[PDB]
């Protein structure tokens, strides 16, 4: 399908953006294992470093796995922008 | 105190009539009659 | 021995008569003025004549000063509130009737004025009726010199 | 728009003393004065009940009668040249009706629950009898109301029924259908007043 | 004195609502009636169209 | 910790040159001028800029207000 | 040496101002407000960084000064298509032709953004962060504090002997996770928006220094620039210095009864000296405030009637419209005065816009990004999938354009109306030679 | 123990919640109709589409009736006033919501009939419009019930 | 040893003198500002004497602005009360008059420059009728004076 | 230890927070409609691109709703007061900005439907002006989010 | 020694002040930009020149902020009650007495700049008629401070 | 010893601030918008450098985010009540002003940019006269930013 270059080039621009932000969230989550402080931690929150290290690292898979959706969207995009 | 039982309920049914002759009255008001009559 | 701001009423009347009166007197002089000032674009020789009815208008301020100083004249600290009714009853009573005056004045002036110069034996009937307004304005008057002397 | 004029500036003069007064009461750190509690429990459950039975009576009626005139003038003045509209058309006037009497039978319903207290102290006094005459205020309220739109809105539409109707015959049994709906909106309302009144006493 | 009250007017909620209303009418009769005669329309014809 | 006189002396040093020897190192063309109070004004207004939002953090009267689980969070990472 | 326009050859002459493919834009943004005389200073030499530079302080964020850099430079590396193309969008025209000024205002986003330290309402931090020690924290008879911390946050005590240290550049990552940042930065960014303000202000009447010895007006400098220049500097550079020496002459062991730096401005103007109630600055403050009130009162007569009436005195003297003239003074003095009141508040704009960027980022990356983030694993990924791209529509909807789009007006303004016309005066023609333009026609 | 009065503000919401949604469908219901016939004169054929815009006005009389109904049951006269509050903030939220609602329902469908009148391919567009009302109603719903259960 | 709030009545007095006759003024100079502009398309030579009905409407401002300062430099904080209600009712008397005359003055210059500008011979009239506005407000001045020194 | 009533204040904010909005969003989807059904009959092509006003103001109902929701998930009887006033305040703060936000929209729309349909090249400015809408109703939601937190 | 709630009056008048003269300003602004707009198209030469009409509205404004602030810096907790009415006086008597002078400057302008483009000479008259509603405002200013410091 | 209800008057405060700036803004950004759709029709070219009166309306709009984020920071429980006031006038100061700000900037940009499209040399004439409408927000702004830290 053809959809208008004009909006495959969005969704090329808005795709590389998405990795590039992901994938550095993903790090940060990895080496701050943080100023975002968001990890979704438990009410009943006991003295376990190990606790949040292991949500943190989800969090930074959850943030690879929908860059690769952004690289999957790209290289459908990108294709439809050379047929058009 | 400003107001009694008594004389607050009072002015709860009156405010009751004042809408009701307010609005009757409003219409009886608004009332026209004719310029002219159509033909002889 | 007598109540509390108790000549807070007869304060509010000597204010009160001198404002309602210059509102009247207001009111008929802009109406006079207005239809003077297109009148006599017509017929200049009139423009005299035609005063009157502001001349006239300013009796009823004239009023108004008059009761105003009349209270006022009245005022002290220690009043048995009676005697400031009064004194609100009278200021009030000049007031709003010279106001009533101050409309009749007004209108009626326009009216003869823009009539006296389409008719000239207007004038006479003109006068008449501008008598008959600042007679009403008096009895308001009239009552506020007999209310604030009781 | 002079009368509108008077209305709107009592209206504001109306809320704007309220304003000062509530606000000054605040200010003033006035012991509680404005008590709510004590406007609603002094007030005789009596009055809140009869008021309630007469909005319901009442306000369905004015609902009714205001359709009635909104359909009435456009029959009458389309039937100059349509008189066939009189056959069909009528029903819109039926529909008012129908509004007018959702109000009475809920209205009598209330007033059967009406019974004295001789009663005095509030205090400990009448506890269901002020729950029973709150409810019965607010389900009259609620049916009233619900009729007065309804009979406005049967009419509005009626008039249109009967203005289409007048040019093409085969329009009214199709635009039915939205009085019908109009006539819904009332019913809802006197359920809801079933409901509110379903388990109220006095005594 | 004492914290001692004024004596703030026996039966003060029948004077404060008589004076209250009573004046409030009073003082709308006459916002009203002032109105329609300030307004007062004199019709604007006869003279007034050839003087404006 | 930090002292405030090094960052001082490091970012003096860097915009300073760029707005004191910068100019002192550009081509004769056109340019010239253009290119100078391009240098000067950028030293100028990036030091201040800088400079204010440092010197405003010294001497502070209050520190900040940290939620009681970021606390225990920061107390085991730094 | 400053750039004016060139020689054309009793009449006006048109004002010509050579530009190249950068400095066009530039001085297209000032043309747009008027042309200037001829032989005005040019202020598109200083515009080209002054107003790069106030708006990123506007607009100071990383992570869309990337955003608004890389699309400036798409359009430089397209330059060549686009110029080379028909462009029948009057909205990417516009950009296109303001592409040069565009990528400084990016450059300096991203310079501001770093020192403000916010990325999309995150910090950047360097493991420099040394603001406070918590571990010294629990030291500071701290013992077992998050017990009830569960119910409470618990402010960070200054000069505990163990806290302090400013960070190395920009401020400390610490605040953006504070509940008081809208304190500590607000406050940062409220007083340097006046003290960049008047500076710039400051440099603007400098200016007309040079043109008044261009133009050889004696009497624009005896009688105007310096009391002038006194006038402004008396009282809003006086403001900017007791700013700075509060940051270093008082610390948080003077915290409570601090000296209020606007009471004591407010005071200053008013002469208001009361006994007790304020601390001072520093002994002998009074006399000073005194003092450079009294000045900047006694620098209006200068401004405000010497020149009429030596003028009218040269008339008699070498023998002039004299009601004209000092009608023309006055208005000038009048203005002048007023508006530098004006003025310095006018430059609020830097405050007002960095601050509602700063908190629209906060809270659309708190309420719409952070929602894309879930405990459970494929579903968490792929609904971050969906939830980003709407976040970058909005971060670019709102943010990028939006809030560029005002900021960038905002600064515009501020060099339209309160420096501009500190120096940058009365009108000219624009210059239109013979010219061979209908070449891309 | 549980005061007295309480339950006042509760069939207050139960009230308010029934009568101002029954006004945003009498609105939205009579401004269709009126629409509607409108167009049948010119056009017949067009009648059952122009239908649904009465029925997006019932469901606000539904959503009404939704809470008014959950209130009503709820209503007791041992009310711990916490309740009562919530009862009447669920009456007011669903019920002016869906009145606003109702009325954006109305001038969109009255307006979207005449319009499709001329245009028929107007058909999908009004009627995409009238479902952002129609949740604007929905919203009021959501809110009332949380609160009314909390 | 009085009531706490008793200066509070002086205050409005001096308030309320100032700001009446100010919108008096106001009033007199808009009306007759939007007169005068049409004036001078038909005789510009009368652009100068056309400007007299502002200045007596500055001087309905000046009457408040004297009365106002009167009663502040008269208002202490231990005030006597009975002072207090004299200065309110000053403030409004020389106020709520100089507000009337403002309307006379507006109104009547209007209408009057607008005649005067057809026909010249009008001026003279529009002085005078102009001058017992003036005297009407005066009468407010005259008794706040009066009240305020009683 | 807390006060009666206390709950009264926030459950007004939530239902004050949800009921504006929808006033707001209302509105601007009314005034949109009738562009749009008025528009599109001249330029159906436009027809999808008109519908754009109507979802800004669907997003100034969102704005409403989570706030209101927030506050209800947050409310509770035993409320200390000062939390319940700050309910009220983010309440009132979102729905009332978001209401003067649905006017700008509605107004907005209203013309730019027009004047699109008159001039293509209005598109991008009429998106603009709705940004700046949209921003308006945020400014709301951000501050009503501070004080429901603080 | 006197009430905690003695500051609210001093406070507010501190707003009025600023609030009432931003109001006339903004009237004088908003009716003198709408004239010169018109009068821009009938000649260039005097868009630069009719902004007077607003500058002088600029000095309503700032006569306003002037007070406010000058109350606001005097305002304290332990108010002396005294003080405090003094404030809320000059805080209204400023506001409100800019605010009349406002719309003299509105409406003035707007007939000056209209007539001055068919007859220059009333350049001059309308700046003259400006004044006086300029010296009507700061009579406000000297009572405000009067009533400020006494 | 902290009075109760002291928090709502300064919770009023920060909602005042933001609430009537975004009226303001929301008014100023309806006209405009509404000149601006209008004006595309003929001169589509002078459509992106009409946006500035939109601008401008929305700074006005954050001057009221800027002080409800102030005061929503500064306020707590244990409120001593001055404080309160002053925050209660700081909201009500820059909310207020702003709104009458709002007016200006509206209308006059509605005019300027009708105008411009006839004429493009009021280009500068229309900034300069918003500039002064801008200004009167700022100087709301100034007051309470000075109230909020007295």
């Given at each position: 399908?053809?959809?208008?270059?004009?909006?495959?080039?969005?969704?090329?621009?808005?795709?590389?953006?998405?990795?590039?932000?992901?994938?550095?969230?993903?790090?940060?989550?990895?080496?701050?294992?943080?100023?975002?402080?968001?990890?979704?931690?438990?009410?009943?929150?006991?003295?376990?470093?190990?606790?949040?290290?292991?949500?943190?690292?989800?969090?930074?898979?959850?943030?690879?796995?929908?860059?690769?959706?952004?690289?999957?969207?790209?290289?459908?995009?990108?294709?439809?922008?050379?047929?058009? | 105190?400003?107001?009694?039982?008594?004389?607050?309920?009072?002015?709860?049914?009156?405010?009751?009539?004042?809408?009701?002759?307010?609005?009757?009255?409003?219409?009886?008001?608004?009332?026209?009659?004719?310029?002219?009559?159509?033909?002889? | 021995?007598?109540?509390?701001?108790?000549?807070?009423?007869?304060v509010?009347?000597?204010?009160?008569?001198?404002?309602?009166?210059?509102?009247?007197?207001?009111?008929?002089?802009?109406?006079?003025?207005?239809?003077?000032?297109?009148?006599?674009?017509?017929?200049?020789?009139?423009?005299?004549?035609?005063?009157?009815?502001?001349?006239?208008?300013?009796?009823?301020?004239?009023?108004?000063?008059?009761?105003?100083?009349?209270?006022?004249?009245?005022?002290?600290?220690?009043?048995?509130?009676?005697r400031?009714?009064?004194?609100?009853?009278?200021?009030?009573?000049?007031?709003?009737?010279?106001?009533?005056?101050?409309?009749?004045?007004?209108?009626?002036?326009?009216?003869?004025?823009?009539?006296?110069?389409?008719?000239?034996?207007?004038?006479?009937?003109?006068?008449?009726?501008?008598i008959?307004?600042?007679?009403?304005?008096?009895y308001?008057?009239?009552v506020?010199?007999?209310?604030?002397?009781? | 728009?002079?009368?509108?004029?008077?209305?709107?500036?009592?209206?504001?003069?109306?809320?704007?003393?309220?304003?000062?007064?509530?606000?000054?009461?605040?200010?003033?750190?006035?012991?509680?004065?404005?008590?709510?509690?004590?406007?609603?429990?002094?007030?005789?459950?009596?009055?809140?009940?009869?008021?309630?039975?007469?909005?319901?009576?009442?306000?369905?009626?004015?609902?009714a009668?205001?359709?009635?005139?909104?359909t009435?003038?456009?029959?009458?003045?389309?039937?100059?040249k349509?008189?066939?509209?009189?056959?069909?058309?009528?029903?819109?006037?039926?529909?008012?009706?129908?509004?007018?009497?959702?109000?009475?039978?809920?209205?009598?319903?209330?007033?059967?629950?009406?019974?004295?207290?001789?009663?005095?102290?509030?205090?400990a006094?009448?506890?269901?009898?002020?729950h029973?005459?709150?409810?019965?205020?607010?389900?009259?309220?609620t049916?009233?109301?619900?009729?007065?739109?309804?009979?406005?809105?049967?009419?509005?539409?009626?008039?249109?029924?009967?203005?289409?109707?007048?040019?093409?015959?085969?329009?009214?049994?199709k635009i039915?259908?939205?009085?019908?709906?109009?006539?819904?909106?009332?019913?809802?309302?006197?359920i809801?007043?079933?409901?509110?009144?379903?388990?109220?006493?006095?005594? | 004195?004492?914290?001692?009250?004024?004596?703030?007017?026996?039966?003060?909620?029948?004077?404060?609502?008589?004076?209250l209303?009573?004046?409030?009418?009073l003082?709308l009769?006459?916002?009203?009636?002032?109105?329609?005669?300030?307004?007062?329309?004199?019709?604007?014809?006869?003279?007034?169209?050839?003087?404006? | 910790?930090?002292?405030?006189?090094?960052?001082?002396?490091?970012?003096?040093?860097?915009?300073?040159?760029?707005?004191?020897?910068?100019?002192?190192?550009?081509?004769?063309?056109?340019?010239?001028?253009?290119?100078?109070?391009?240098?000067?004004?950028?030293?100028?207004?990036?030091?201040?800029?800088?400079?204010?939002?440092?010197?405003?953090?010294?001497?502070?009267?209050?520190?900040?207000?940290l939620?009681?689980?970021?606390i225990?969070?920061?107390?085991?990472?730094? | 040496?400053?750039?004016?326009?060139?020689?054309?050859?009793?009449?006006?002459?048109?004002?010509?101002?050579?530009?190249?493919?950068?400095?066009?834009?530039?001085?297209?943004?000032?043309?747009?407000?008027?042309?200037?005389?001829?032989?005005?200073?040019?202020?598109?030499?200083?515009?080209?960084?002054?107003?790069?530079?106030?708006?990123?302080?506007?607009?100071?964020?990383?992570?869309?000064?990337?955003?608004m850099?890389?699309?400036?430079?798409?359009?430089?590396?397209?330059?060549?298509?686009?110029?080379?193309?028909?462009?029948?969008?009057?909205?990417?025209?516009?950009?296109?032709?303001?592409?040069?000024?565009?990528?400084?205002?990016?450059?300096?986003?991203?310079?501001?953004?770093?020192?403000?330290?916010?990325?999309?309402?995150?910090?950047l931090?360097?493991f420099?962060?040394?603001?406070?020690?918590?571990?010294?924290?629990?030291?500071?008879?701290?013992?077992?504090?998050?017990?009830?911390?569960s119910?409470?946050?618990?402010?960070?005590?200054?000069?505990?002997?163990?806290?302090?240290?400013?960070?190395?550049?920009?401020?400390?990552?610490?605040?953006?996770?504070?509940?008081?940042?809208?304190?500590?930065?607000?406050?940062?960014?409220?007083?340097?928006?006046?003290?960049?303000?008047?500076?710039?202000?400051?440099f603007?009447?400098?200016?007309?220094?040079?043109?008044?010895?261009?133009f050889?007006?004696?009497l624009?400098?005896?009688?105007?620039?310096?009391?002038?220049?006194?006038?402004?500097?008396?009282?809003?550079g006086?403001?900017?210095?007791?700013?700075?020496?509060?940051?270093?002459?008082?610390?948080?062991?003077?915290?409570?009864?601090?000296?209020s730096?606007?009471?004591?401005f407010?005071?200053?103007?008013?002469?208001?000296?009361?006994?007790?109630?304020?601390?001072?600055?520093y002994?002998?403050?009074?006399?000073?405030?005194?003092?450079?009130?009294?000045?900047?009162?006694?620098?209006?007569?200068?401004?405000?009637?010497?020149?009429?009436?030596?003028?009218?005195?040269?008339?008699?003297?070498?023998?002039?419209?004299?009601?004209?003239?000092?009608?023309?003074?006055?208005?000038?003095?009048?203005?002048?005065?007023?508006?530098?009141?004006?003025?310095?508040?006018?430059?609020?704009r830097?405050?007002?816009?960095?601050?509602?960027?700063?908190?629209?980022?906060?809270?659309?990356?708190?309420?719409?990004?952070?929602?894309?983030?879930?405990?459970?694993?494929?579903?968490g990924?792929?609904?971050?999938?969906?939830?980003?791209?709407?976040f970058?529509?909005?971060?670019?909807?709102?943010?990028?354009?939006?809030e560029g789009?005002?900021?960038?007006?905002?600064?515009?303004?501020?060099?339209?109306?309160?420096?501009?016309?500190?120096?940058?005066?009365?009108?000219?023609?624009?210059?239109?030679?013979?010219?061979?333009?209908?070449?891309?026609?």
């Open positions: 399908l053809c959809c208008g270059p004009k909006l495959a080039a969005c969704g090329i621009v808005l795709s590389a953006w998405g990795v590039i932000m992901l994938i550095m969230l993903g790090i940060f989550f990895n080496v701050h294992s943080l100023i975002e402080d968001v990890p979704f931690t438990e009410k009943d929150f006991e003295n376990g470093p190990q606790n949040i290290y292991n949500l943190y690292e989800q969090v930074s898979y959850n943030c690879f796995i929908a860059a690769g959706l952004y690289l999957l969207l790209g290289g459908f995009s990108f294709c439809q922008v050379r047929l058009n | 105190g400003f107001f009694s039982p008594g004389i607050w309920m009072g002015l709860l049914t009156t405010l009751f009539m004042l809408f009701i002759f307010t609005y009757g009255l409003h219409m009886i008001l608004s009332l026209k009659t004719m310029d002219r009559f159509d033909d002889r | 021995n007598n109540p509390e701001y108790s000549s807070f009423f007869g509010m009347g000597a204010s009160s008569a001198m404002v309602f009166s210059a509102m009247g007197a207001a009111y008929g002089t802009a109406k006079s003025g207005t239809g003077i000032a297109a009148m006599s674009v017509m017929r200049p020789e009139l423009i005299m004549k035609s005063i009157i009815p502001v001349v006239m208008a300013g009796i009823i301020a004239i009023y108004g000063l008059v009761v105003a100083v009349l209270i006022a004249n009245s005022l002290t600290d220690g009043i048995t509130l009676y400031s009714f009064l004194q609100l009853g009278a200021g009030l009573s000049v007031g709003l009737s010279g106001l009533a005056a101050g409309f009749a004045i007004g209108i009626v002036g326009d009216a003869g004025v823009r009539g006296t110069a389409q008719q000239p034996r207007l004038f006479v009937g003109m006068i008449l009726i501008l008959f307004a600042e007679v009403l304005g008096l308001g008057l009239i506020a010199l007999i209310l604030s002397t009781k | 728009t002079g009368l509108e004029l008077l209305y709107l500036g009592i209206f504001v003069a109306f809320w704007a003393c309220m304003i000062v007064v509530g606000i000054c009461y605040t200010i003033f750190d006035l012991g509680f004065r404005f008590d709510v509690a004590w406007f609603l429990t002094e007030t005789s459950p009596f009055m809140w009940s009869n008021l309630g039975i007469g909005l319901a009576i009442s306000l369905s009626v004015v609902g009668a205001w359709g009635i005139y909104i009435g003038s456009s029959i009458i003045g389309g039937g100059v349509a008189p066939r509209i009189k056959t069909k058309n009528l029903v819109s006037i039926i529909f008012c009706e129908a509004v007018a009497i959702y109000g009475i039978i809920m209205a009598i319903v209330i007033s059967n629950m009406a019974e004295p207290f001789s009663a005095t102290d509030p205090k006094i009448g506890h269901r009898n002020y029973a005459g709150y409810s019965m205020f607010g389900a009259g309220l049916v009233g109301l619900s009729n007065l739109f309804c009979g406005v809105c049967v009419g509005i539409v009626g008039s249109g029924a009967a203005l289409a109707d007048a040019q093409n015959p085969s329009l009214f049994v039915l259908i939205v009085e019908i709906f109009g006539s819904a909106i009332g019913l809802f309302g006197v809801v007043a079933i409901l509110q009144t379903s388990r109220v006493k006095m005594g | 004195p004492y914290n001692l009250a004024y004596k703030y007017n026996l039966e003060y909620s029948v004077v404060f609502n008589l004076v209303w009573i004046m409030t009418g003082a009769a006459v916002i009203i009636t002032s109105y329609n005669i300030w307004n007062m329309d004199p019709g604007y014809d006869s003279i007034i169209y050839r003087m404006t | 910790a930090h002292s405030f006189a090094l960052p001082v002396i490091i970012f003096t040093t860097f915009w300073g040159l760029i707005g004191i020897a910068g100019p002192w190192f550009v081509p004769k063309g056109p340019n010239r001028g253009v290119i100078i109070t391009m240098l000067v004004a950028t030293a100028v207004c990036c030091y201040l800029f800088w400079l204010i939002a440092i010197l405003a953090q010294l001497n502070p009267l209050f520190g900040p207000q939620k009681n689980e970021t225990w969070y920061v107390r085991f990472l730094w | 040496e400053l750039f004016r326009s060139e020689e054309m050859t009793n009449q006006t002459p048109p004002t010509y101002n050579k530009t190249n493919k950068f400095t066009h834009g530039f001085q297209n943004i000032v043309d747009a407000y008027g042309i200037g005389t001829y032989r005005e200073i040019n202020p598109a030499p200083y515009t080209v960084i002054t107003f790069p530079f106030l708006f990123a302080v506007m607009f100071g964020d990383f992570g869309h000064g990337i955003l850099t890389l699309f400036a430079v798409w359009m430089v590396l397209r330059e060549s298509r686009i110029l080379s193309q028909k462009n029948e969008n009057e909205m990417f025209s516009m950009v296109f032709s303001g592409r040069y000024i565009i990528l400084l205002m990016g450059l300096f986003s991203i310079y501001t953004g770093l020192i403000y330290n916010d990325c999309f309402s995150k910090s931090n360097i420099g962060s040394s603001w406070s020690v918590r571990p010294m924290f629990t030291i500071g008879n701290w013992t077992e504090e998050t017990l009830l911390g119910s409470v946050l618990q402010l960070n005590p200054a000069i505990p002997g163990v806290f302090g240290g400013p960070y190395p550049f920009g401020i400390d990552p610490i605040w953006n996770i504070a509940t008081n940042k809208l304190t500590f930065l607000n406050s940062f960014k409220m007083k340097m928006s006046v003290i960049l303000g008047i500076i710039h202000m400051l603007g009447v400098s200016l007309s220094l040079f043109n008044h010895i261009y050889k007006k004696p624009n400098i005896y009688f105007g620039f310096i009391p002038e220049i006194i006038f402004m500097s008396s009282l809003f006086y403001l900017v210095i007791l700013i700075f020496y509060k940051w270093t002459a008082y610390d948080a062991h003077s915290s409570r009864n601090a000296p730096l606007l009471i004591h407010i005071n200053m103007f008013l002469f208001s000296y009361p006994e007790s109630g304020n601390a001072m600055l002994s002998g403050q009074k006399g000073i405030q005194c003092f450079l009130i009294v000045v900047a009162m006694l620098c209006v007569p200068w401004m405000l009637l010497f020149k009429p009436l030596i003028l009218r005195h040269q008339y008699l003297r070498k023998k002039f419209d004299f009601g004209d003239t000092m009608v023309h003074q006055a208005i000038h003095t009048i203005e002048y005065c007023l508006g530098c009141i004006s003025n310095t508040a006018s430059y609020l830097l405050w007002a816009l960095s601050l509602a960027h700063a908190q629209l980022s906060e809270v659309l990356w708190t309420m719409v990004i952070h929602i894309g983030l879930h405990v459970r694993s494929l579903a990924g792929l609904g971050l999938f969906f939830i980003f791209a709407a970058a529509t909005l971060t670019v909807a709102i943010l990028l354009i939006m789009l005002s900021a960038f007006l905002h600064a515009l303004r501020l060099h339209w109306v309160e420096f501009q016309n500190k120096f940058y005066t009365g009108t000219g023609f624009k210059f239109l030679p013979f010219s061979f333009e209908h070449i891309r026609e």
